[PDB]
Amino acid sequence: NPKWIGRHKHMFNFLDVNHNGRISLDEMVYKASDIVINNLGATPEQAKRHKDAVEAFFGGAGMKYGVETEWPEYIEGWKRLASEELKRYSKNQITLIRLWGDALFDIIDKDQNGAISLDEWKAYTKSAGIIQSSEDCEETFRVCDIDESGQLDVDEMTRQHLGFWYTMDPACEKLYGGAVP
Ligand SMILES: [Ca+2]
Ligand SMILES: [Ca+2]
Ligand SMILES: [Ca+2]
């Protein structure tokens, strides 16, 4: 699973505030709160809801306040969480990631219309530390926007999070690495 592992290594590095190669729940929750408040302009109410949910999400992966976790244990923790949460999702049940994604959604939905516009998505992608062209940002928006409505709903954004945090690499390759001639 090199692609899932790679997303997770880049995220571990992003949330490892002191850059020492070990991570705590304090680092992870600190950096996530800092971004929602200072990059995405969350209100106090918004930030507290997000804090509680992100704490439960990252806690589910086995991270704890006051404890430093090394990479092997970190990634095994995410594997375990992903496996349990994908079972819940398969049974149409509530997940920790869905609860997190709900609190985040309210914050990135700046115009409170219940859908994420392209502009809203550009701000969110930037908040996660991504630097990329307009064209690349638009492509990942189109990928997220399954019904091509032009805005991203809660279900689309849930699938987005599930794909990033939990979904393992496809078992088989496609002809042309999945490209179309
Ligand atoms: Ca650290
Ligand atoms: Ca909106
Ligand atoms: Ca849509």
mmCIF file with all atom_site columns, C-alpha atoms and ligand atoms in Angstrom:
data_model
loop_
_atom_site.group_PDB
_atom_site.id
_atom_site.type_symbol
_atom_site.label_atom_id
_atom_site.label_alt_id
_atom_site.label_comp_id
_atom_site.label_asym_id
_atom_site.label_entity_id
_atom_site.label_seq_id
_atom_site.pdbx_PDB_ins_code
_atom_site.Cartn_x
_atom_site.Cartn_y
_atom_site.Cartn_z
_atom_site.occupancy
_atom_site.B_iso_or_equiv
_atom_site.pdbx_formal_charge
_atom_site.auth_seq_id
_atom_site.auth_comp_id
_atom_site.auth_asym_id
_atom_site.auth_atom_id
_atom_site.pdbx_PDB_model_num
ATOM   1   C  CA . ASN A 1 1   ? 0.000   0.000  0.000   1.00 0.00 ? 1   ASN A CA 1
ATOM   2   C  CA . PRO A 1 2   ? 2.631   2.655  -0.960  1.00 0.00 ? 2   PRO A CA 1
ATOM   3   C  CA . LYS A 1 3   ? 0.092   5.384  -1.810  1.00 0.00 ? 3   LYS A CA 1
ATOM   4   C  CA . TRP A 1 4   ? -1.845  5.141  1.505   1.00 0.00 ? 4   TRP A CA 1
ATOM   5   C  CA . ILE A 1 5   ? 1.442   4.876  3.388   1.00 0.00 ? 5   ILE A CA 1
ATOM   6   C  CA . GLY A 1 6   ? 2.781   7.925  1.505   1.00 0.00 ? 6   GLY A CA 1
ATOM   7   C  CA . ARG A 1 7   ? -0.318  10.078 2.280   1.00 0.00 ? 7   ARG A CA 1
ATOM   8   C  CA . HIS A 1 8   ? 0.085   9.029  5.896   1.00 0.00 ? 8   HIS A CA 1
ATOM   9   C  CA . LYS A 1 9   ? 3.820   9.766  6.023   1.00 0.00 ? 9   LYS A CA 1
ATOM   10  C  CA . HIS A 1 10  ? 3.262   13.260 4.586   1.00 0.00 ? 10  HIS A CA 1
ATOM   11  C  CA . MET A 1 11  ? 0.456   13.896 7.119   1.00 0.00 ? 11  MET A CA 1
ATOM   12  C  CA . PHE A 1 12  ? 2.522   12.582 10.066  1.00 0.00 ? 12  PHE A CA 1
ATOM   13  C  CA . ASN A 1 13  ? 5.266   15.041 8.986   1.00 0.00 ? 13  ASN A CA 1
ATOM   14  C  CA . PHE A 1 14  ? 2.702   17.862 8.628   1.00 0.00 ? 14  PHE A CA 1
ATOM   15  C  CA . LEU A 1 15  ? 1.287   17.361 12.159  1.00 0.00 ? 15  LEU A CA 1
ATOM   16  C  CA . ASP A 1 16  ? 4.703   16.617 13.798  1.00 0.00 ? 16  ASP A CA 1
ATOM   17  C  CA . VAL A 1 17  ? 4.924   20.243 14.986  1.00 0.00 ? 17  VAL A CA 1
ATOM   18  C  CA . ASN A 1 18  ? 8.503   19.959 16.368  1.00 0.00 ? 18  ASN A CA 1
ATOM   19  C  CA . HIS A 1 19  ? 9.753   17.918 13.410  1.00 0.00 ? 19  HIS A CA 1
ATOM   20  C  CA . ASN A 1 20  ? 11.416  15.232 15.591  1.00 0.00 ? 20  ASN A CA 1
ATOM   21  C  CA . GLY A 1 21  ? 9.919   12.217 13.840  1.00 0.00 ? 21  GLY A CA 1
ATOM   22  C  CA . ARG A 1 22  ? 7.757   11.200 16.796  1.00 0.00 ? 22  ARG A CA 1
ATOM   23  C  CA . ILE A 1 23  ? 4.160   12.405 17.263  1.00 0.00 ? 23  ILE A CA 1
ATOM   24  C  CA . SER A 1 24  ? 1.724   13.119 20.114  1.00 0.00 ? 24  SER A CA 1
ATOM   25  C  CA . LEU A 1 25  ? -2.041  13.809 20.250  1.00 0.00 ? 25  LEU A CA 1
ATOM   26  C  CA . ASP A 1 26  ? -1.023  17.228 21.548  1.00 0.00 ? 26  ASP A CA 1
ATOM   27  C  CA . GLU A 1 27  ? 0.855   17.913 18.297  1.00 0.00 ? 27  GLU A CA 1
ATOM   28  C  CA . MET A 1 28  ? -1.930  16.567 16.097  1.00 0.00 ? 28  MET A CA 1
ATOM   29  C  CA . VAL A 1 29  ? -4.803  18.398 17.797  1.00 0.00 ? 29  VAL A CA 1
ATOM   30  C  CA . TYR A 1 30  ? -2.749  21.564 18.239  1.00 0.00 ? 30  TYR A CA 1
ATOM   31  C  CA . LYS A 1 31  ? -1.908  21.853 14.517  1.00 0.00 ? 31  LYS A CA 1
ATOM   32  C  CA . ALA A 1 32  ? -5.461  20.961 13.335  1.00 0.00 ? 32  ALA A CA 1
ATOM   33  C  CA . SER A 1 33  ? -7.012  23.589 15.688  1.00 0.00 ? 33  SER A CA 1
ATOM   34  C  CA . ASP A 1 34  ? -4.448  26.166 14.653  1.00 0.00 ? 34  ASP A CA 1
ATOM   35  C  CA . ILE A 1 35  ? -5.396  25.705 11.015  1.00 0.00 ? 35  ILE A CA 1
ATOM   36  C  CA . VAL A 1 36  ? -9.159  25.843 11.465  1.00 0.00 ? 36  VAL A CA 1
ATOM   37  C  CA . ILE A 1 37  ? -8.929  28.980 13.650  1.00 0.00 ? 37  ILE A CA 1
ATOM   38  C  CA . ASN A 1 38  ? -6.205  30.897 11.835  1.00 0.00 ? 38  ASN A CA 1
ATOM   39  C  CA . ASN A 1 39  ? -6.454  29.707 8.195   1.00 0.00 ? 39  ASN A CA 1
ATOM   40  C  CA . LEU A 1 40  ? -10.141 28.937 7.957   1.00 0.00 ? 40  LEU A CA 1
ATOM   41  C  CA . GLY A 1 41  ? -11.566 31.490 10.365  1.00 0.00 ? 41  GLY A CA 1
ATOM   42  C  CA . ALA A 1 42  ? -13.527 29.128 12.626  1.00 0.00 ? 42  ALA A CA 1
ATOM   43  C  CA . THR A 1 43  ? -15.619 30.821 15.344  1.00 0.00 ? 43  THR A CA 1
ATOM   44  C  CA . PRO A 1 44  ? -15.012 29.675 18.937  1.00 0.00 ? 44  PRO A CA 1
ATOM   45  C  CA . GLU A 1 45  ? -18.133 27.441 18.730  1.00 0.00 ? 45  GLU A CA 1
ATOM   46  C  CA . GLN A 1 46  ? -16.931 25.992 15.396  1.00 0.00 ? 46  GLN A CA 1
ATOM   47  C  CA . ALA A 1 47  ? -13.424 25.427 16.745  1.00 0.00 ? 47  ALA A CA 1
ATOM   48  C  CA . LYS A 1 48  ? -14.632 23.640 19.879  1.00 0.00 ? 48  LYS A CA 1
ATOM   49  C  CA . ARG A 1 49  ? -16.910 21.290 17.884  1.00 0.00 ? 49  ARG A CA 1
ATOM   50  C  CA . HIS A 1 50  ? -13.980 20.581 15.541  1.00 0.00 ? 50  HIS A CA 1
ATOM   51  C  CA . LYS A 1 51  ? -11.597 20.106 18.430  1.00 0.00 ? 51  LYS A CA 1
ATOM   52  C  CA . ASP A 1 52  ? -13.826 17.504 20.132  1.00 0.00 ? 52  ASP A CA 1
ATOM   53  C  CA . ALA A 1 53  ? -14.361 15.595 16.902  1.00 0.00 ? 53  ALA A CA 1
ATOM   54  C  CA . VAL A 1 54  ? -10.689 15.697 15.735  1.00 0.00 ? 54  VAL A CA 1
ATOM   55  C  CA . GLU A 1 55  ? -9.577  14.555 19.190  1.00 0.00 ? 55  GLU A CA 1
ATOM   56  C  CA . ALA A 1 56  ? -11.926 11.527 18.960  1.00 0.00 ? 56  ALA A CA 1
ATOM   57  C  CA . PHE A 1 57  ? -10.822 10.797 15.351  1.00 0.00 ? 57  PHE A CA 1
ATOM   58  C  CA . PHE A 1 58  ? -7.071  10.955 16.009  1.00 0.00 ? 58  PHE A CA 1
ATOM   59  C  CA . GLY A 1 59  ? -7.614  9.251  19.403  1.00 0.00 ? 59  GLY A CA 1
ATOM   60  C  CA . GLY A 1 60  ? -9.252  6.389  17.553  1.00 0.00 ? 60  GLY A CA 1
ATOM   61  C  CA . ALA A 1 61  ? -5.984  5.872  15.683  1.00 0.00 ? 61  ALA A CA 1
ATOM   62  C  CA . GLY A 1 62  ? -4.425  5.295  19.163  1.00 0.00 ? 62  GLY A CA 1
ATOM   63  C  CA . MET A 1 63  ? -2.762  8.664  19.802  1.00 0.00 ? 63  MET A CA 1
ATOM   64  C  CA . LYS A 1 64  ? -2.842  10.035 23.313  1.00 0.00 ? 64  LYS A CA 1
ATOM   65  C  CA . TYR A 1 65  ? -2.152  13.320 25.081  1.00 0.00 ? 65  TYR A CA 1
ATOM   66  C  CA . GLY A 1 66  ? 1.265   13.274 26.826  1.00 0.00 ? 66  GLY A CA 1
ATOM   67  C  CA . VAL A 1 67  ? 2.543   10.294 24.885  1.00 0.00 ? 67  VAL A CA 1
ATOM   68  C  CA . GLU A 1 68  ? 4.925   10.348 21.913  1.00 0.00 ? 68  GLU A CA 1
ATOM   69  C  CA . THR A 1 69  ? 4.300   7.738  19.231  1.00 0.00 ? 69  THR A CA 1
ATOM   70  C  CA . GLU A 1 70  ? 6.822   6.503  16.753  1.00 0.00 ? 70  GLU A CA 1
ATOM   71  C  CA . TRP A 1 71  ? 5.994   5.797  13.118  1.00 0.00 ? 71  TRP A CA 1
ATOM   72  C  CA . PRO A 1 72  ? 5.511   1.956  13.270  1.00 0.00 ? 72  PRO A CA 1
ATOM   73  C  CA . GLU A 1 73  ? 2.942   2.229  16.060  1.00 0.00 ? 73  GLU A CA 1
ATOM   74  C  CA . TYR A 1 74  ? 1.357   5.317  14.528  1.00 0.00 ? 74  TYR A CA 1
ATOM   75  C  CA . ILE A 1 75  ? 0.738   3.603  11.206  1.00 0.00 ? 75  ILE A CA 1
ATOM   76  C  CA . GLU A 1 76  ? -0.433  0.337  12.797  1.00 0.00 ? 76  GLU A CA 1
ATOM   77  C  CA . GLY A 1 77  ? -2.940  2.437  14.832  1.00 0.00 ? 77  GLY A CA 1
ATOM   78  C  CA . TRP A 1 78  ? -4.311  3.967  11.594  1.00 0.00 ? 78  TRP A CA 1
ATOM   79  C  CA . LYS A 1 79  ? -4.555  0.562  9.957   1.00 0.00 ? 79  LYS A CA 1
ATOM   80  C  CA . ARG A 1 80  ? -6.689  -0.687 12.852  1.00 0.00 ? 80  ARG A CA 1
ATOM   81  C  CA . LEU A 1 81  ? -8.917  2.351  12.917  1.00 0.00 ? 81  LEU A CA 1
ATOM   82  C  CA . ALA A 1 82  ? -9.399  2.270  9.150   1.00 0.00 ? 82  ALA A CA 1
ATOM   83  C  CA . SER A 1 83  ? -10.384 -1.415 9.249   1.00 0.00 ? 83  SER A CA 1
ATOM   84  C  CA . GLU A 1 84  ? -12.984 -0.846 12.007  1.00 0.00 ? 84  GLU A CA 1
ATOM   85  C  CA . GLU A 1 85  ? -14.387 2.344  10.506  1.00 0.00 ? 85  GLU A CA 1
ATOM   86  C  CA . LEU A 1 86  ? -14.730 0.857  7.017   1.00 0.00 ? 86  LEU A CA 1
ATOM   87  C  CA . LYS A 1 87  ? -16.820 -1.943 8.583   1.00 0.00 ? 87  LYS A CA 1
ATOM   88  C  CA . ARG A 1 88  ? -19.057 0.656  10.218  1.00 0.00 ? 88  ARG A CA 1
ATOM   89  C  CA . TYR A 1 89  ? -19.333 2.620  6.966   1.00 0.00 ? 89  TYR A CA 1
ATOM   90  C  CA . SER A 1 90  ? -20.142 -0.577 5.049   1.00 0.00 ? 90  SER A CA 1
ATOM   91  C  CA . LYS A 1 91  ? -23.066 -1.105 7.455   1.00 0.00 ? 91  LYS A CA 1
ATOM   92  C  CA . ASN A 1 92  ? -24.219 2.493  6.890   1.00 0.00 ? 92  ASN A CA 1
ATOM   93  C  CA . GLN A 1 93  ? -23.295 3.445  10.484  1.00 0.00 ? 93  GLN A CA 1
ATOM   94  C  CA . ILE A 1 94  ? -21.813 6.608  11.934  1.00 0.00 ? 94  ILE A CA 1
ATOM   95  C  CA . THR A 1 95  ? -18.005 6.810  12.025  1.00 0.00 ? 95  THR A CA 1
ATOM   96  C  CA . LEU A 1 96  ? -15.460 8.942  13.861  1.00 0.00 ? 96  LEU A CA 1
ATOM   97  C  CA . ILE A 1 97  ? -14.264 10.298 10.544  1.00 0.00 ? 97  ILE A CA 1
ATOM   98  C  CA . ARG A 1 98  ? -17.805 11.256 9.538   1.00 0.00 ? 98  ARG A CA 1
ATOM   99  C  CA . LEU A 1 99  ? -18.212 13.178 12.857  1.00 0.00 ? 99  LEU A CA 1
ATOM   100 C  CA . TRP A 1 100 ? -14.900 14.920 12.228  1.00 0.00 ? 100 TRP A CA 1
ATOM   101 C  CA . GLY A 1 101 ? -15.823 15.664 8.644   1.00 0.00 ? 101 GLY A CA 1
ATOM   102 C  CA . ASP A 1 102 ? -19.158 17.151 9.771   1.00 0.00 ? 102 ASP A CA 1
ATOM   103 C  CA . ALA A 1 103 ? -17.476 19.625 12.124  1.00 0.00 ? 103 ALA A CA 1
ATOM   104 C  CA . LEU A 1 104 ? -14.864 20.493 9.466   1.00 0.00 ? 104 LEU A CA 1
ATOM   105 C  CA . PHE A 1 105 ? -17.534 20.882 6.767   1.00 0.00 ? 105 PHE A CA 1
ATOM   106 C  CA . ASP A 1 106 ? -19.329 23.630 8.720   1.00 0.00 ? 106 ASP A CA 1
ATOM   107 C  CA . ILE A 1 107 ? -16.046 25.568 8.883   1.00 0.00 ? 107 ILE A CA 1
ATOM   108 C  CA . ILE A 1 108 ? -15.086 25.255 5.220   1.00 0.00 ? 108 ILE A CA 1
ATOM   109 C  CA . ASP A 1 109 ? -18.634 26.111 4.170   1.00 0.00 ? 109 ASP A CA 1
ATOM   110 C  CA . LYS A 1 110 ? -18.020 29.831 4.574   1.00 0.00 ? 110 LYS A CA 1
ATOM   111 C  CA . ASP A 1 111 ? -21.315 30.945 2.858   1.00 0.00 ? 111 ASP A CA 1
ATOM   112 C  CA . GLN A 1 112 ? -23.360 28.516 5.005   1.00 0.00 ? 112 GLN A CA 1
ATOM   113 C  CA . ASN A 1 113 ? -25.333 27.205 1.970   1.00 0.00 ? 113 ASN A CA 1
ATOM   114 C  CA . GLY A 1 114 ? -24.536 23.572 2.958   1.00 0.00 ? 114 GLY A CA 1
ATOM   115 C  CA . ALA A 1 115 ? -22.278 22.867 -0.054  1.00 0.00 ? 115 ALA A CA 1
ATOM   116 C  CA . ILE A 1 116 ? -18.619 23.533 -0.842  1.00 0.00 ? 116 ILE A CA 1
ATOM   117 C  CA . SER A 1 117 ? -17.959 25.777 -3.795  1.00 0.00 ? 117 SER A CA 1
ATOM   118 C  CA . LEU A 1 118 ? -14.695 25.670 -5.754  1.00 0.00 ? 118 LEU A CA 1
ATOM   119 C  CA . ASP A 1 119 ? -13.479 28.765 -3.941  1.00 0.00 ? 119 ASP A CA 1
ATOM   120 C  CA . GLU A 1 120 ? -14.259 27.171 -0.604  1.00 0.00 ? 120 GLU A CA 1
ATOM   121 C  CA . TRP A 1 121 ? -12.371 24.056 -1.685  1.00 0.00 ? 121 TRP A CA 1
ATOM   122 C  CA . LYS A 1 122 ? -9.366  26.119 -2.776  1.00 0.00 ? 122 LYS A CA 1
ATOM   123 C  CA . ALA A 1 123 ? -9.173  27.604 0.692   1.00 0.00 ? 123 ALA A CA 1
ATOM   124 C  CA . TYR A 1 124 ? -9.503  24.227 2.346   1.00 0.00 ? 124 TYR A CA 1
ATOM   125 C  CA . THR A 1 125 ? -6.802  22.581 0.163   1.00 0.00 ? 125 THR A CA 1
ATOM   126 C  CA . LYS A 1 126 ? -4.460  25.427 0.992   1.00 0.00 ? 126 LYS A CA 1
ATOM   127 C  CA . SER A 1 127 ? -5.166  24.996 4.734   1.00 0.00 ? 127 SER A CA 1
ATOM   128 C  CA . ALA A 1 128 ? -3.952  21.360 4.491   1.00 0.00 ? 128 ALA A CA 1
ATOM   129 C  CA . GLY A 1 129 ? -0.607  22.643 3.257   1.00 0.00 ? 129 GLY A CA 1
ATOM   130 C  CA . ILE A 1 130 ? -1.097  21.819 -0.416  1.00 0.00 ? 130 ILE A CA 1
ATOM   131 C  CA . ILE A 1 131 ? 0.529   24.050 -2.999  1.00 0.00 ? 131 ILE A CA 1
ATOM   132 C  CA . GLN A 1 132 ? -0.750  23.482 -6.533  1.00 0.00 ? 132 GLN A CA 1
ATOM   133 C  CA . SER A 1 133 ? -1.965  25.202 -9.682  1.00 0.00 ? 133 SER A CA 1
ATOM   134 C  CA . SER A 1 134 ? -5.536  26.262 -10.250 1.00 0.00 ? 134 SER A CA 1
ATOM   135 C  CA . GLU A 1 135 ? -5.867  23.424 -12.799 1.00 0.00 ? 135 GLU A CA 1
ATOM   136 C  CA . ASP A 1 136 ? -4.799  20.778 -10.277 1.00 0.00 ? 136 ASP A CA 1
ATOM   137 C  CA . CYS A 1 137 ? -7.122  22.151 -7.625  1.00 0.00 ? 137 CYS A CA 1
ATOM   138 C  CA . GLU A 1 138 ? -9.984  22.028 -10.168 1.00 0.00 ? 138 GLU A CA 1
ATOM   139 C  CA . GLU A 1 139 ? -9.222  18.452 -11.079 1.00 0.00 ? 139 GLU A CA 1
ATOM   140 C  CA . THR A 1 140 ? -9.381  17.237 -7.468  1.00 0.00 ? 140 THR A CA 1
ATOM   141 C  CA . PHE A 1 141 ? -12.596 19.252 -7.056  1.00 0.00 ? 141 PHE A CA 1
ATOM   142 C  CA . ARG A 1 142 ? -14.058 17.415 -10.147 1.00 0.00 ? 142 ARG A CA 1
ATOM   143 C  CA . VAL A 1 143 ? -12.967 14.111 -8.713  1.00 0.00 ? 143 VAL A CA 1
ATOM   144 C  CA . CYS A 1 144 ? -14.734 14.938 -5.419  1.00 0.00 ? 144 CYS A CA 1
ATOM   145 C  CA . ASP A 1 145 ? -17.848 16.254 -7.197  1.00 0.00 ? 145 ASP A CA 1
ATOM   146 C  CA . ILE A 1 146 ? -19.342 12.878 -8.109  1.00 0.00 ? 146 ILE A CA 1
ATOM   147 C  CA . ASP A 1 147 ? -22.706 14.167 -9.451  1.00 0.00 ? 147 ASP A CA 1
ATOM   148 C  CA . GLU A 1 148 ? -20.982 17.080 -11.187 1.00 0.00 ? 148 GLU A CA 1
ATOM   149 C  CA . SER A 1 149 ? -23.388 19.492 -9.513  1.00 0.00 ? 149 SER A CA 1
ATOM   150 C  CA . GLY A 1 150 ? -20.609 22.108 -9.284  1.00 0.00 ? 150 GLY A CA 1
ATOM   151 C  CA . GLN A 1 151 ? -20.498 22.021 -5.466  1.00 0.00 ? 151 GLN A CA 1
ATOM   152 C  CA . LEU A 1 152 ? -19.514 19.456 -2.905  1.00 0.00 ? 152 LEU A CA 1
ATOM   153 C  CA . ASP A 1 153 ? -22.075 18.020 -0.555  1.00 0.00 ? 153 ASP A CA 1
ATOM   154 C  CA . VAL A 1 154 ? -21.588 16.387 2.856   1.00 0.00 ? 154 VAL A CA 1
ATOM   155 C  CA . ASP A 1 155 ? -21.645 12.846 1.332   1.00 0.00 ? 155 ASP A CA 1
ATOM   156 C  CA . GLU A 1 156 ? -19.058 13.831 -1.335  1.00 0.00 ? 156 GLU A CA 1
ATOM   157 C  CA . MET A 1 157 ? -16.830 15.333 1.316   1.00 0.00 ? 157 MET A CA 1
ATOM   158 C  CA . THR A 1 158 ? -17.224 12.191 3.506   1.00 0.00 ? 158 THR A CA 1
ATOM   159 C  CA . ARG A 1 159 ? -16.117 9.995  0.624   1.00 0.00 ? 159 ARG A CA 1
ATOM   160 C  CA . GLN A 1 160 ? -13.202 12.393 0.135   1.00 0.00 ? 160 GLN A CA 1
ATOM   161 C  CA . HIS A 1 161 ? -12.033 11.892 3.723   1.00 0.00 ? 161 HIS A CA 1
ATOM   162 C  CA . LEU A 1 162 ? -12.629 8.137  3.635   1.00 0.00 ? 162 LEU A CA 1
ATOM   163 C  CA . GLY A 1 163 ? -10.510 7.819  0.476   1.00 0.00 ? 163 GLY A CA 1
ATOM   164 C  CA . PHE A 1 164 ? -7.601  9.797  1.980   1.00 0.00 ? 164 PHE A CA 1
ATOM   165 C  CA . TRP A 1 165 ? -7.419  8.435  5.523   1.00 0.00 ? 165 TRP A CA 1
ATOM   166 C  CA . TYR A 1 166 ? -8.692  4.867  5.267   1.00 0.00 ? 166 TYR A CA 1
ATOM   167 C  CA . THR A 1 167 ? -8.865  3.449  1.734   1.00 0.00 ? 167 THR A CA 1
ATOM   168 C  CA . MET A 1 168 ? -6.053  1.024  0.904   1.00 0.00 ? 168 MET A CA 1
ATOM   169 C  CA . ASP A 1 169 ? -4.370  0.915  -2.564  1.00 0.00 ? 169 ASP A CA 1
ATOM   170 C  CA . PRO A 1 170 ? -6.434  -0.792 -5.329  1.00 0.00 ? 170 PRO A CA 1
ATOM   171 C  CA . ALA A 1 171 ? -5.600  -4.543 -5.507  1.00 0.00 ? 171 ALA A CA 1
ATOM   172 C  CA . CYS A 1 172 ? -5.099  -4.528 -9.314  1.00 0.00 ? 172 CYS A CA 1
ATOM   173 C  CA . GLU A 1 173 ? -3.685  -2.165 -11.861 1.00 0.00 ? 173 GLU A CA 1
ATOM   174 C  CA . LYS A 1 174 ? -5.525  -0.802 -14.811 1.00 0.00 ? 174 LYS A CA 1
ATOM   175 C  CA . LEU A 1 175 ? -4.426  -0.892 -18.351 1.00 0.00 ? 175 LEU A CA 1
ATOM   176 C  CA . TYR A 1 176 ? -2.480  2.408  -19.000 1.00 0.00 ? 176 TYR A CA 1
ATOM   177 C  CA . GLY A 1 177 ? -2.202  3.057  -15.299 1.00 0.00 ? 177 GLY A CA 1
ATOM   178 C  CA . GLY A 1 178 ? -5.858  4.048  -15.557 1.00 0.00 ? 178 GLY A CA 1
ATOM   179 C  CA . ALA A 1 179 ? -5.429  6.652  -18.345 1.00 0.00 ? 179 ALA A CA 1
ATOM   180 C  CA . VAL A 1 180 ? -7.638  6.932  -21.412 1.00 0.00 ? 180 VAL A CA 1
ATOM   181 C  CA . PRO A 1 181 ? -6.134  7.300  -24.896 1.00 0.00 ? 181 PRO A CA 1
HETATM 182 CA CA . CA  B 2 .   ? 6.985   15.574 17.368  1.00 0.00 ? 1   CA  B CA 1
HETATM 183 CA CA . CA  B 2 .   ? -20.736 27.049 0.622   1.00 0.00 ? 2   CA  B CA 1
HETATM 184 CA CA . CA  B 2 .   ? -21.860 17.643 -6.006  1.00 0.00 ? 3   CA  B CA 1
#
